[PDB]
Every structure is written in structure tokens, then in C-alpha cells.
């Protein structure tokens, strides 16, 4: 007969708390809070990876093509986002430890650090952090912190398809992009040209000289969206992550989100942004706690400490930057290519 | 030397997830979340036990008498509050599991249930909640001892009885208080008068104690009111924070029970639980003041009077209640 | 050009703070907190009403029929829940006021109370709380607080279609229920009857299980008892029509089918809102207990004891959505498509 | 008789919502959310100002000297951080507005913006955000803003109180003189240990780390270095207020120091939460605008990112004192 403790394997979970300060002569009371906190984070990291891998598989094995699977995909991605909120507020518990009491056992931690968290790196990689985009500390690649089987695992996570790459391929298949079909991009380029011209004609008919200047730059940006060569250049700089065609699909889903087939997909894209946003907030809440804990002391793990972490709060680690930056090309509602009754029907369940 | 995963014994923590649906033929994806969620709770239960026992020990070994320890005491108790708030919020994660998906692996859980959580019971007992069939062997022992050892309620109680100002040949708070309330009432209804004076009925209080309506002794109650009214006095400041934290822990506990109820409702409807209870209904009954260990601290708000009525503290007792 | 303060009408919002303790002689510092806190609850009440009326309108005027609008409906209802979530937590700001400090200005408040909040009642009604659902004290006093224009709005909020009623009509049109078509209810009764029979066979092949089985057979088959449904629909155990219940269950079982994906989100949101309204009632209670103890309320209720009575399923407008969990069956039994 | 709606002045509060999009024809449903959200923020800003001024007065009028008042001071300061935490969470509400729906009424907002929030500026100044923006303000509002720059800030008031911390006096406990003495000996003893070790790469690694540590620790006792950093703005507290804060950190368990230590912790909490407000703000603004310039004239997203830095952290020094934490046995005995 199943027993709660055995089902949950608490004989392992609740016998995993060894205070290094205890195993060295003077246990420091607050080291217990320190271990439990990290262990709770790591248990949730594992859950995130579980969801994340299942969603990667759904894309990879072709099942995302069958649109009855979108509810499951969006519901699991949103769950990753919900766990991450919890992880962001979880720092409030560690923050009840003063820096003085932390100071009483910090000496027993060296040279271990969060640099040695296998799962945090797995998670970064599987979402789609580019290894060359990573802020360096001590002049070498992050994987130097791992050896053997763990190193092997990390390498596979750098090599296997990332959430970013999977979502990208799917985005490239978004209905409506086909030039000989609805031809979204063609119609969009045309409609933006018209809009601008009607807008310029309206303007030229202090405010004027300014509105002209304001017009002139909005025009450059909007029209630059159709410069594919410019995009390719920004791709290789890692300034952009998505392929030109994938950007098109994403924009297609933004504009026509209310169309029934695009409603859950638009929720997914929103979730992808949520997850980028939560991950960075995790980083920043981390940074704020570490400032109070260390001041400007160097880290047990070999970094500058507070200062290094601060530099990781940046778009370098924002995998779906392209989804955020699409808001740059938002246009007036009536500029958006109208849908005929055939494609309106194409995009119905 | 030391490595992250070894340090945290991730070898154990991250190798502790066995889907009962998987070992039984058809693995259900959402059972992983079900397992991880309970494991995170238990970890935090263990942390709470760790803080709680450490605070009980400070009361027990006499260190609480040394008032330089109050900061340690309040801060650890506040920490318990903070952890509990996260635990209340943590239900929102499990709530991303639809009842339908839950329904796909629930069959593999019987007869197990939360009734078998050792740490939850240890928690309730050590705080002062006044089922053990669900345990036996060595676990029944710890459970036994947690009922027999002095509770947080009893330890706070004794400490509350030693509160300065409560001695009849000293500042005589209680005598002075009955005088000022007898005066102020007749200076000024019958219903408030009835209630306010019943505070001075020690006999009524003892009767309510045995009835279980009240937990703290009469004397301990007096110290608590003394700390409320004079909380700004330096020696009472951190003690007042402590009383506040005790009340915090009480609310968060039932808020835990209640968020639990709301989720279980959506998961089970009116089905009976795997542990043999009526389920939702049974859980609804635990969200009551029967489980509120520090009810008296809440109830004291009944007897709050105008500032004027409060026994003026002369310069003698003022300098005494200075650090 | 417009300016922030003017745009937001801050000349109204930030000039709305009058400390009654200050008006009557002695300013008590924490009354400001007290005031701002309610004002913020009411701004959000207004917002909730705004989302809510607009979703009601989408149902009422037929727009929901075009499923293009389902993203809007679910986004706004989920928005209502996100706001309620914030409002549950907002109590922690007022909890930084000790009971002893509150007691220094409580006297200047009587006989006014939260009981006189028009928007809270509007919200209750527009979601769908019926007069019968209300606690006896509340039923004969909630409307006896307002007059004229406010009383006008209250009557409307009850006379007009509720979210409950509107969602009920729409659930009744759930594709799949039509007997000439997919005949969901017919297939379901057949499959469950077959399932129970296979199950009873398995248990006979092997004392507790037969007893468990029997209770479960009793409950499941009872689902198909429409008369029982109406009887319960009169003791107030149930609120939704029979057919609407079938639509809800249809959306649960077939939630992955694309036309049901967003509808399923909506039912979940509906339950979220119910939960969060009660968690609001309960956080409220927990606070008030520490503020009043056993003292009666300024509005004349018993205080703690009364408020605690509102933390009841009798106030859950969508109880049925919760209670359909009672009737969940193994995947295998669900009628195939 | 007093009535709820009247008490709260809801005739003002619930009649303050004017959708500009509506005023110009096409009502956009989400503009209402946008308005209510900002209005809620401003009510909470007002509450913060209220609490914050009350605490400033306690200091300014000398009431902090009477230590009866420390419970009030800390509880109100803690109250401020509890409000700020809600304000940070409050962004999640506005985040249920998509960028495309925001786009439908954004044009009606120009040229208003958060630059024109009076209360947010007052908040910054009163806490003590160093000057080195009033363009967006005029008239009486401009006046108030000046007054907030000239009146004593929370930072300045806490600084003065820290300068009066008991224990600092040289002919009394002489905390600083003793602290320097013990640090110097502590390091010299640590250095003896390292020297004893056998010549290795590890030993040199320990010597090298030691030297870096010794230099940092002992620079605590360089007052000229501190003054130089003050002038550069890289620091904010006087040298002596720093000694007081350190005194309170080290001896926090001493009864007279318990609640003051809570106070200092609360200050760091508020810095931490202000910057978390700015960053949550940033994250939302990126989804809303991408790289479009703000209606208020800034570059937008890029500008807001720059406000998320220690340039705005009023109590940096309280954070940076963790740089000088030492082993317990080096702390001067009482
Ligand atoms: C007192 C509390 C903490 C301190 C002082 C601290 C400090 C640091 C420091 C200084 C680093 C940079 C590496 C180094 O030089 O050591 C770091 C990295 C890291 N820490 Fe923390 N940390 C704390 C709490 C936590 C917690 C609770 C977690 C939960 C898993 C965590 C996870 C990580 C991770 C994943 C990294 C790598 C981050 C990256 O490179 O982006 N830390 N930490
Ligand atoms: C889908 C989620 C859950 C369901 C359906 C559920 C259901 C139940 C039920 C029906 C009971 C009463 C005993 C029984 O008949 O089995 C119970 C008890 C209990 N469960 Fe949960 N539960 C859930 C999640 C959790 C979680 C995540 C925890 C975290 C540790 C937890 C901890 C407890 C505790 C401590 C009790 C005993 C409570 C008391 O007696 O006051 N449960 N649960
Ligand atoms: C110190 C804080 C509070 C106390 C002591 C308190 C107390 C009470 C009491 C006693 C009642 C019952 C009516 C009566 O007899 O007066 C009540 C009802 C109510 N209050 Fe509060 N309250 C507090 C804060 C709030 C806040 C912040 C709100 C936010 C809007 C609020 C809104 C309401 C509402 C809507 C009702 C009617 C509830 C129902 O009928 O279910 N109250 N309150
Ligand atoms: C869709 C939502 C929002 C957007 C797109 C947005 C955008 C911006 C931008 C672009 C600026 C820089 C000035 C400019 O060029 O306009 C700014 C500043 C500011 N905003 Fe927001 N904002 C939003 C919501 C809010 C909310 C809810 C508040 C609450 C009061 C707020 C308060 C402020 C404040 C106080 C500033 C000045 C901050 C500083 O200069 O450090 N904003 N905002
Ligand atoms: N489901 C189809 C079509 C598709 C691709 N990307 C999409 C985005 C939104 C909606 C549909 C699609 C496929 O995967 O090939
Ligand atoms: N790197 C941290 C120490 C630390 C944080 N989390 C850890 C987990 C395990 C081991 C060490 C750590 C510091 O410099 O203070
Ligand atoms: N510390 C002393 C005095 C004391 C008892 N109870 C208190 C409550 C508040 C302040 C001081 C006390 C003791 O433990 O006996
Ligand atoms: N008692 C729960 C099952 C359950 C909840 N949490 C558990 C933890 C372990 C084992 C079983 C459970 C039910 O009736 O559905
Ligand atoms: N949208 C159609 C059909 C419908 C009713 N209820 C539904 C639930 C889910 C999907 C479609 C429907 C209508 O309103 O009449
Ligand atoms: N009913 C509350 C008083 C109260 C709570 N919230 C209010 C808002 C406005 C006016 C009065 C109130 C009591 O009995 O103490
Ligand atoms: N309260 C006294 C002494 C004092 C100043 N700073 C302190 C810090 C901690 C404890 C006491 C003090 C004063 O204001 O002058
Ligand atoms: N600054 C925002 C507009 C904005 C945000 N909050 C505001 C409050 C009032 C007026 C305008 C705003 C933008 O550039 O899009």
C-alpha cells in the first residue's frame, strides 16, 4: 500500500541537509535556510526542464502540426512562467538572512557556487541562450565549471534543438505568408507605403517641422522592416535571433491574433516573452539580494560578484528579443491588410 | 574542494522523483509536477520545523530571559511567516494542473494522502494545536514526543506571565486597569460595559480555558495586554512585534488550509479523498478557530479602550522599561 | 498638449482624502492609510466592473457567436482574475496597521462601513449572486443602504442579465449536444453504463471495492437524472440548467479540440474568479478578526462572525463548474470522435 | 450620518476616468485599464509620501532621540516597503494589455508621460536621489519640487542620526580605534598562517587573495579616500555615519541596537524595491514599445534601462558595508 513518504521519496529529500559549518565544528543556524532554499530552487528547475523538454519534443517530433496540441503547449509554457514567478518571490525568504549571519558560514562554501548548477545552465541552453552571447568571467567558457557526464550533458543541450529554433521553424510555416496565397508581406509593404504617403500628405498640409522630423524617422524604421539584407546582418551579430520568414509569421500572428487559428498561437508568443521577462527578473532579484550579502566582495565561484551578476541582466540573455522588438513596427489598425472571405475561412477551426 | 551539487546533496534531491503512473504502465506527464510540488512543501516544512524548534529551545533553555535574544527570536518567527506566505502562494503552481489531467493518475495514489505527512503534524503540534493512526514505528515516536514536549504556546505563555508591570506591589497594571475602566464607563453601552468588565472575571476565564475557548492562562493574558498597550516602551517594542508574528503565523496557517480547500474543491468536487476522508467537506472543517492556537491574541482586540483610560505610566516605570 | 495630471484627473483623485479624525479634532496618522486603501480597492472594483460589463455585452448582443471574439472574452476574464489576485494581497498593506492604532480613529467612522460599497454589490450581482444565495443578515440589508441614483444602479445590476445567465445560454448552444448530431449526452450515458459494467466485472473476478464501486455507480448514473437536477436546482445546490451542464462537461472532455481550447480557458477563468472572490472574503475576515475581535461592526453586523459566514459556497456563482469534478471518468470511457 | 461613499469621497475618485480615445471619437476598451492602473499607482505614491514625511519629521523635530519612537519609525518605514512590493506586483495587471491594443490609443497620449508625475519626483527627492527634469513642471508644482530638493532628505536625516550612534566616542567605547586595531592584528595573524604554508600555486593564490582583502579592509580606515568618493558621488553618507551603521550591524543584538538594525534593513529594502519598480517598469515598456521613442520625448526603453543603476540607490553605503564584514572574533568585545 502506497505511503505518502515513500511515494514522495522523502527518505532522500529530507535527508539531504548537511551543514558544512556543522561538519567542521560550529554549525551556523542560518546555513540550514541557505541549503533548503537552493534545494527548493533546484527542485523547481527540474520541473521547468521537464515541461520545457516535453514542449521541445512536441515541436521536434511533428505533433505541433496537429493544432489540437496547442492547448497543451501553451498551458505548459504558461506553467513554466507560473513557477518562475514563484522562484522570483522565493528570494524574499533568503533575504530574511542578514549579511552578518551569512558571513558566519560563507567561509565553508568556497570554491562552490551557482556557476556549478547543472540545471540552471541546462535551462538557459534549452530555451536558447547563445553561448557566445554569454558574459564572460575569468576569460573562459562557462562549461569549464563541469566535467565528465555533466559536461557531456551540457554540450548536448548546446547542440540539440532549442525552444527558440523549434518555435522558429514552426513560425516559418505560419499560414498566410505564401506569396501566391494571402501574400501577407507583399500586402503589408504596399499598405505601409500607402499609409505613410497619406500621412505625409496630411502633414505637409513648430508642430509641422517636428511632425515632419517625427514622421521621417518612423518612416525609416517601418520601411527598414522590409530590408531583408539588413536583417541577415543583424542575425549574424546575434542582434536578432529569428529568421526573416519567422519574424513574418510572428508579425502575422500579432496582427491577426483574433482569427480563431491564431488565438492560442498568440498566447504562446506572449508566454515566450513572459518567460524571457521572468528569467531576467529572477536575475535581477538575485543581483539585489547578492548586493546586500556581499557588497563588493568577490564571489566564492571566481567572479567579481555583485558586479558580474549585474552584467547578466541584459538583452544578451533575452532569447526572444525579436518578439519584444516587433512592437517597434506596430501600425495603425486600418493599415493592416484586410482579409477576404476565403482566408477568413482558411483561418477557422 | 566543495562542489555545489555535493554540498546540496542533489544526488538525493534530484533523484527522488518516481512517477507511480510510470512504474505502473502509463506515465502521466502532470504527475511530475504533483510530486515536485509536494517535495518543495516538505522541504519548507522542514525549514519551519528548524526555525520553530530553535525558538522553542531559546525559550526553554532560558535564553529568552536575556533580552538581547529577542531580535533573533522575532526575526526567526518572522521568517516562518515569510516562508508560509510563499507556501500559500505555491498552490498557484499546482493549480496549473487541470482536474482532468489530475484524474489521469489519481488512481495510482490510493491509499496515500497528506494525512501521512509527518512534518505537517509535527508543525501543528509544536505550535500548539491541542490521526496518529496514520503513523507507526519510529515516526509515531517523534509524533508522540511533539505532543509531550513544551509547545510554542506554552513557552510563550510562561514568558508572558513574567512580563514586567504585572506585579500587584509594583506597577499593578491589572488593578490600575480595572480602576480606570470602572471609572471611565460610569463617567460615560450596557453591552460594551458587560463585555469590558468580564475581562476581570478570572473565574469566567478559567471556565473558558477548560472549555477550550481560550488557551493562555489569565496571567499570560495580562502580560499580552500590557505589551499591547505599552508597546512603544523600548523593552516592549520587539516583544510586541513577536506577538504580532504569532498572530501572523496563525493566519497564514489557516490561509494555507483555505487555499488548499479551494484547490481541492476544483480537483475532487465532492469525491471522497484517497486518505478516506470526505475530502473537500472534511478539509472545510479544519478552516476554523479550533485550530487557531493564539486566538487570545486576536480576541484581545475586543477589550481595546480609549487612550486616556490606559494606566498612565509614571517616570519610575518608564525608566525601568528602558534598555 | 495634454498633461499627465490632467489626463489622469489627479486633481480629483489626489484631492479625495479627508481624515475624519482630523475633521473632528485629532488627526490619527493611520486613517490616511485606511482611506487610501479603500480608494484603491474601489478603483479596481470599477475596472472589474468595466471588464465585466463589456464581456456581458459581448454575450448579450450576440458577438460571442463569432468565435473570433473568444480571445477578447478570455483575456478580459483572466484580467479580472489577475486584478482580484492583486486585491487579495492588497490586504497585507492594511495589516501593517495595528489593531491599537485603528482603535484610535474607529469611533469617527460609525455608522459607515464596507457594507455600503455600491460597487462591491454591483460586482456581486453582475457576476450572478442571487438574493437567496445571500446570508440572511445580508439579504435584508445589502440593498437597504442606498437610495435614488445608487438604488437605481443596484436594481439594474439585478434585473439585467448576469454573467451566470449569459454563460448559461451560451453553454446551452455548445456544439456536440444535439441529439441528431454527435449526441454527446446519449453516448456518454451509454459509455458510462458500459464502463461501470466492465468495472463491476473486474471487481467480482477478485469487500471494500464493491462498496466503493457502488457509491461511485450511484453518483455517476445520477448525473443522468434530470429531475434530481431540478430538485437540486431549487435547494440552491446547483445553479446552471441541465443542458448548460452538458455543454460545460462537453468542453471539459473535449477541451483539446481546437474550437474548445479557448472556451475551456474561459470556464477555468470563471472558476478562478469564484475562488478569488472567496479568498478575498477570507483574507478580509482574517484581518477583521485581528481588528475587532468580537466587537460588533460599525455597520451593525456581528462583525467577525458575520463576515465568516460569507465564506461559503452559497456565494460561489459557478459551483457547478467545480462540482463537475465529481463526475470525471477514465479517458477510455469518453465517447470517441 | 457618515456614509462610505462620502467618507471615501468616491464622487471624486470614481468620476475621474476620461478615455481620451473616447473624447476624440473611437473609444478603445483598454485605455480605461491604463488610466485606472496609473491612478492606483498615484494613490499609493501619496500614501508613501504621507508615511515618509511623517518619518522625516520625527527625525527633524528631534523625536527620534526619544527611543520610544523607534517602533513607530520602523513600522512606518516597513509599511512603505510593503506598499512598494505591491506596486512592483501591480505591473502584472497592466501587463494583461497587449502591445497591439495599447497601440490603438497610444496616439492620444502625446505628449503626456510619467516624466510629469509630480509625486514620483517628490518621492525620489525626499528619499534622497542626488541631483547630478523639472522642465516638465510649472507653477506651484515646480515650487513643491524645489522645496523637496532643499528640505532635508531621509538620507540626510538618517545620516545625522547615525552620526549620534552610541559607542563611537573615542574616550568611550572607541569603536573605530578598536576596530582598526583588531583588523590590523587579524590580518597580520592571517598572514603568518599563509607564510607557513609550502611554496605552491595555491599558496601564491592565497597570498594574492590576502593582499586584495587587506587593501580593501584597511581602506575602510582611509578617511581621505572616503571624502574623495563622496565628492565623486560614488558614496553618500558621511564618514562618521558609516561608523555608526557599522556599529549597529556588528552589535545589532544589543537591545538599544535591535530596532535601529531593523531600520537600516528597511532602508535597504526600500532602495531594493524602488529599483525593482524601475526594472519591472522597463521589462513591460520593452514589450509595449520595442525601441520606439517615448511620448515624453526620451529614447524610451533604452532611457529607462539607464535608471536601473546604483546612481539611484540612495543607501548604497548600507549595501557596501557588507564589503567589510570580518570574522566574529575580530569584532571588539563589549
Ligand atoms: C546569500 C545568497 C547568495 C549569494 C551571496 C550568491 C552569490 C552569487 C555569486 C557571487 C555568483 C557569481 C559566481 C561567484 O562568483 O560565486 C552567483 C551565481 C549564481 N547563483 Fe547565487 N547567490 C546566492 C543565492 C543563490 C540562490 C538561492 C540560488 C538558487 C539556485 C543561486 C543560484 C545561482 C546561479 C544559477 C548562478 C549562476 C548565475 C549566472 O551566471 O547567471 N544563488 N551567486
Ligand atoms: C491536486 C492536489 C491535492 C488534492 C486533490 C488534495 C486532496 C486532499 C484530501 C482529500 C485530503 C484529506 C485526506 C484524504 O481524504 O485524502 C488532503 C489532506 C492533506 N493534504 Fe492535500 N491535496 C492536494 C495537494 C496537497 C499539497 C500540494 C500538499 C502539500 C504538502 C498537501 C498537504 C496535505 C496535508 C498537510 C493534509 C492534511 C490536512 C489536515 O488534516 O488538516 N495537499 N488533501
Ligand atoms: C481595519 C480594516 C477593516 C475592518 C475592521 C472591517 C470590518 C468590516 C465589518 C465589521 C463588516 C461587516 C459590516 C459591519 O458590521 O460594519 C465589513 C464589511 C465589508 N467590508 Fe470591511 N473592514 C475593513 C477593511 C475593508 C477594506 C480594505 C475593504 C475594501 C473595499 C472592505 C470592504 C468591505 C465590504 C465590501 C463589506 C461587505 C462584505 C459582505 O457583505 O460580504 N473592508 N467590514
Ligand atoms: C503601457 C504602459 C507604459 C508605458 C509604455 C510606459 C512608458 C514610459 C516611457 C517611454 C517613459 C520615459 C519618458 C517618455 O519618453 O515617455 C516612462 C517614464 C515613466 N513612467 Fe511609464 N510607462 C507605462 C506605464 C507606467 C505606469 C503604470 C506608471 C505608474 C505611475 C508609470 C510611471 C512612469 C514614471 C514615474 C516615469 C518617469 C521615470 C523616470 O524618469 O525614471 N509608467 N514610461
Ligand atoms: N499547424 C500548422 C500550421 C501553422 C504553422 N505555424 C502556425 C502558427 C499559427 C497557426 C498555425 C500555424 C503547422 O504546424 O504546420
Ligand atoms: N557564490 C556565493 C556563495 C554561494 C551562493 N550559493 C551557493 C550554493 C552553494 C555553494 C556556495 C554558494 C558567494 O560568493 O558568497
Ligand atoms: N526578559 C525577562 C523579562 C520579561 C518577561 N516577559 C517579558 C515581556 C516583555 C518584555 C520583557 C519581559 C524574562 O524573560 O523574565
Ligand atoms: N488525497 C488526495 C491524493 C493526494 C494528494 N496529495 C498526495 C500526496 C501523496 C499521495 C497522494 C496524495 C486525493 O484524494 O485525491
Ligand atoms: N459560438 C457559437 C457556438 C457555440 C456556443 N457555445 C460554444 C462553446 C464552444 C464552442 C462553440 C460554441 C454560439 O455562440 O452560438
Ligand atoms: N465596519 C468597520 C469600519 C470600516 C471598515 N472599512 C470602512 C470603510 C469606510 C468606513 C468605515 C469602514 C468596523 O466595524 O470597524
Ligand atoms: N536615540 C539617540 C541615540 C542614538 C542615535 N543613533 C542611534 C542608533 C542606535 C541607537 C541609539 C542611537 C539619538 O537620537 O541621539
Ligand atoms: N510614455 C508612454 C505613454 C504613457 C505611459 N504612461 C502614461 C501616463 C500618462 C500619459 C502617457 C503615458 C509612451 O511613450 O508610450
Author numbering:
A (entry chain D): 39 to 243, 248 to 391
B (entry chain C): 39 to 168, 180 to 237, 257 to 391
C (entry chain A): 39 to 244, 251 to 381
D (entry chain B): 39 to 170, 180 to 381
Q: From the publication, what sentences describe this entry?
A:
TDO and IDO are heme proteins that catalyze the oxidative cleavage of L-Trp, the first and rate-limiting step of the kynurenine pathway for L-Trp catabolism. TDOs are homo-tetrameric enzymes with 35–45 kD monomers and are well conserved from bacteria to humans. The hTDO monomer has an all α-helical structure, and the helices are named αA through αL, as in XcTDO. The heme is located at one end of this four-helical bundle, with the proximal His328 ligand coming from the C-terminal region of helix αJ.
To define the binding mode of O2 with respect to L-Trp and to obtain direct molecular insight into the catalytic mechanism, we prepared crystals of ferrous hTDO in complex with L-Trp under anaerobic conditions and then exposed them to an O2-saturated solution at room temperature. In contrast, no electron density for O2 was observed in crystals mounted directly in the glove box, and the structure of hTDO in this binary complex with L-Trp is mostly the same as that obtained following O2 exposure. The recognition of the L-Trp substrate by hTDO is similar to that by XcTDO, as most of the residues in the active site region of the two enzymes are conserved. His76 is hydrogen-bonded to the N1 atom of L-Trp, although this interaction is not essential for TDO catalysis and this residue is replaced by Ser in IDO. The structure revealed that a second L-Trp molecule is bound to each hTDO subunit, with well-defined electron density. This exo site is located at the other end of the four-helical bundle and is ~42 Å from the active site. The side chain of this L-Trp is sandwiched between Trp208 (helix αH) and Pro213, and is in direct contact with several other hydrophobic residues. The main-chain carboxylate group has bidentate ion-pair interactions with the side chain of Arg211 (αH).
